[PDB]
Symmetry: C3
Subunit: 305 residues, 3 copies
Amino acid sequence: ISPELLQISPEVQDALKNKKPVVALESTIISHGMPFPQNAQTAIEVEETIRKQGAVPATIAIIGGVMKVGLSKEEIELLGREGHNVTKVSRRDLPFVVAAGKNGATTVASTMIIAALAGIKVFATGGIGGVHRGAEHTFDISADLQELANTNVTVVCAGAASILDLGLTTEYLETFGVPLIGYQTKALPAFFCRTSPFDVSIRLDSASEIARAMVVKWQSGLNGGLVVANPIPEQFAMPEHTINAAIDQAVAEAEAQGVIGKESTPFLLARVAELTGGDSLKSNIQLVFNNAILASEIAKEYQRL
Amino acid sequence: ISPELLQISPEVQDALKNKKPVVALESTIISHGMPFPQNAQTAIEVEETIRKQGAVPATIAIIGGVMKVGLSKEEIELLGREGHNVTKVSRRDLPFVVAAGKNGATTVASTMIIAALAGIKVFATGGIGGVHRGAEHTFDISADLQELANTNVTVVCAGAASILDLGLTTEYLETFGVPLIGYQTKALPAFFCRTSPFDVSIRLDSASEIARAMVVKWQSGLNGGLVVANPIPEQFAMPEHTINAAIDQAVAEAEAQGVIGKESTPFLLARVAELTGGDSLKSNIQLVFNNAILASEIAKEYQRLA
Amino acid sequence: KISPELLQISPEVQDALKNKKPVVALESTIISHGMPFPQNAQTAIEVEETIRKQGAVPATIAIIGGVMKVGLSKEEIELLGREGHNVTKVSRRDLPFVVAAGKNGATTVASTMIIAALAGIKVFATGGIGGVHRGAEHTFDISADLQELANTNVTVVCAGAASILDLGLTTEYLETFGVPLIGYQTKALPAFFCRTSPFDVSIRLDSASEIARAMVVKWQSGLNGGLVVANPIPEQFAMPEHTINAAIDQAVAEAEAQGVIGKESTPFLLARVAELTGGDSLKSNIQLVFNNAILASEIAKEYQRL
Ligand SMILES: O=c1[nH]cc([C@@H]2O[C@H](COP(=O)(O)O)[C@@H](O)[C@H]2O)c(=O)[nH]1
Ligand SMILES: O=c1[nH]cc([C@@H]2O[C@H](COP(=O)(O)O)[C@@H](O)[C@H]2O)c(=O)[nH]1
Ligand SMILES: O=c1[nH]cc([C@@H]2O[C@H](COP(=O)(O)O)[C@@H](O)[C@H]2O)c(=O)[nH]1
Ligand SMILES: [Mn+2]
Ligand SMILES: [Mn+2]
Ligand SMILES: [Mn+2]
């Protein structure tokens, strides 16, 4: 509530009061999900994509201890340039970055929280956190899934990469009552891959259906979010053997180097990019754009209802 | 909630207005838990069982996109005849069946949600969903358990069959703060069987004690449901070895055949029925009636206090 | 507005809350099931006095004759101590039944957090929290304490937990559920008898003041749930690493061999470790409790200030 705690930029506030569609964006993908310059370049361009769809982007982050909804170009570039030097902020991290007046890059979890505080129901990203490979033994399970269990926001992603255990993730989502919606797909998108061995909970072929389902869900009091898994355009999909070989190697190296906890995902994405000579990153960028277009349509349709 | 979203039948409305005890019933048991004709026959008979006990049944389902509390005989017959062609609806499914104007059969989870929307505190079923065998590696855990964790409804069941991992299920219920009440039993009733190797969290010998505990729990702000595990009547209990052999075989076949997700429980129950020559189904019917009788008493004692 | 039949706050605690004086909650399972008599009672009363010396008001919580009591008389503390295992161990799933049945009960970290929250007390000192058990990846044995920390707004000051638990899995679980794990002046998670474990808290904070500010921001931002503050035992009282880990490993092996499960696990393990260390582990436990009460008092002061 307090302006000391939370600030929405004039553009976003205008859109909100005047009821234009707003699409939220996270910052961990910037600071920890991609290298500089590509991170900031992509963040700025995803905002522009949203605007060209006739919606209003709101990139969320913690700036100087303030939860910020909508960011300046300079702030986005700050997060990008600072990179790993900025705190990665999940639900358990959030109060401390705010209290200490520091900068932080918000994960899907923290971005969902802040968007919900701002009354934004639609959030685009590249991929969600989830159940990690070996989590049956390690218990390494993203707080993103608990946020999806509880917070009312639709998250548009490409599913997630096979760095995660996608099967266990689909089971987990069912247990916690979270819809996993395939956009024009029955198969659950694998991020770099358009398909995977696993299926979504329901296939929906239009943004309008998704928006209507959101309305029914929250009107009926079923709190929690919705995952929309949107397959990467075929043109930008990684070759399967290449990408799965790269992922399997990165996971092995992560194990050997003792990479654990919040350091896992940043480490893995960076290493896969390295092993594919940048191709995986270019794919990530395209899937982010695609997700922002779909998210724009969902937000439009939702505002209309 | 909009009339379009949620409709409570006049009988149930009057019952709630007039402070008469009401017992919710689910619909997944009808469409996916039992074959036709037995499915609709049982659903109608369980309603009558509740009325004979002096309570008012409310069967819950989604009909033409509307969440319905209390159903016509024709709607129940529909759910029974259509069977698997009706969508099985858990928490993650509910919004879409409603939005798309379709019919759906609600699981313990969805039925709890809807019952709670209507102010109904007592729900009779056959067996609850739970932790599946192998869940330590598959993560297959019923959304029913999360609903029990969070939604204010007492669910009367026979425990659950050993198609599930009952040990893991008892641990899960404890972690999530959910009472597992044995009605006149310390051993946890294993559906077809009156006992199992596992324990309920507390034994209570009267519906009155159960109702008192419900009132205290919710007046203390401890949100979430309660499981009442009620052993199948002695006449209908199945001999351990035959039934467990059938269950173990059905589980092994489901694993070999790659049966997963929401298809698992229906597959397992149908197969155990096939392997037992229909006996397991006859027992399932009887434990459902028994649960409706007890649930009727719990509802009566609960309404007495509230 | 909870009924006085269910919940009673002692006049001293009521006055403290009304006068904005810092209050520090204390649990009772540690008394009945966590320590032997007389040591359990003596420690409970002494820790109250510690808190008084630090300028705060202690509130020990328990269920007495069916009433959730916030603040306890010396006699009630002595009763719980003397009765020991005859007093019911009360977690979230137990709570409604001991209250409804008018019985005595000793409240775990989970129940104590619940009642503290009902009273509006934000700071709770204890010895160690429940958590993920060794083998929980197979057994699913995970303390309801962790779900209470996920959801209920109370800071719990502890020594971490002993290696009877799986501390690694516990740190993962806390992350998934959004619960801050604060090391007090330490990055490494304290292991109860041990100052340091081969694990890292989520954040190190060096002062009560920082902790209180974080509490304020967390709850004003609407992130409901608790915070764990893991405070290393003073060096003077720490147990020798090899001796204590040998004792713990033996106790765990014996518990598994004897089929000790569920709510009986932790009390059995702590008792056995105390036996195997000839009482030294208990003396350590007592000292870490006192240390935690001191830090908790400072956090309570700073919180009330803010
Ligand atoms: O392909 C990606 N997946 C996930 C992330 C980020 O990592 C977070 C998950 O991290 P963890 O589960 O450690 O909290 C996501 O919410 C998102 O911010 C990312 O940058 N790129
Ligand atoms: O003996 C039975 N157990 C469970 C069911 C149904 O199956 C649901 C659990 O399915 P799932 O875990 O797949 O959501 C229960 O809530 C109930 O509706 C049933 O029909 N028969
Ligand atoms: O060193 C200890 N750890 C934990 C306990 C008690 O055990 C409870 C956890 O037991 P369970 O997980 O079985 O609910 C804690 O909340 C606390 O009351 C204790 O006495 N001593
Ligand atoms: Mn993780
Ligand atoms: Mn399942
Ligand atoms: Mn346990």
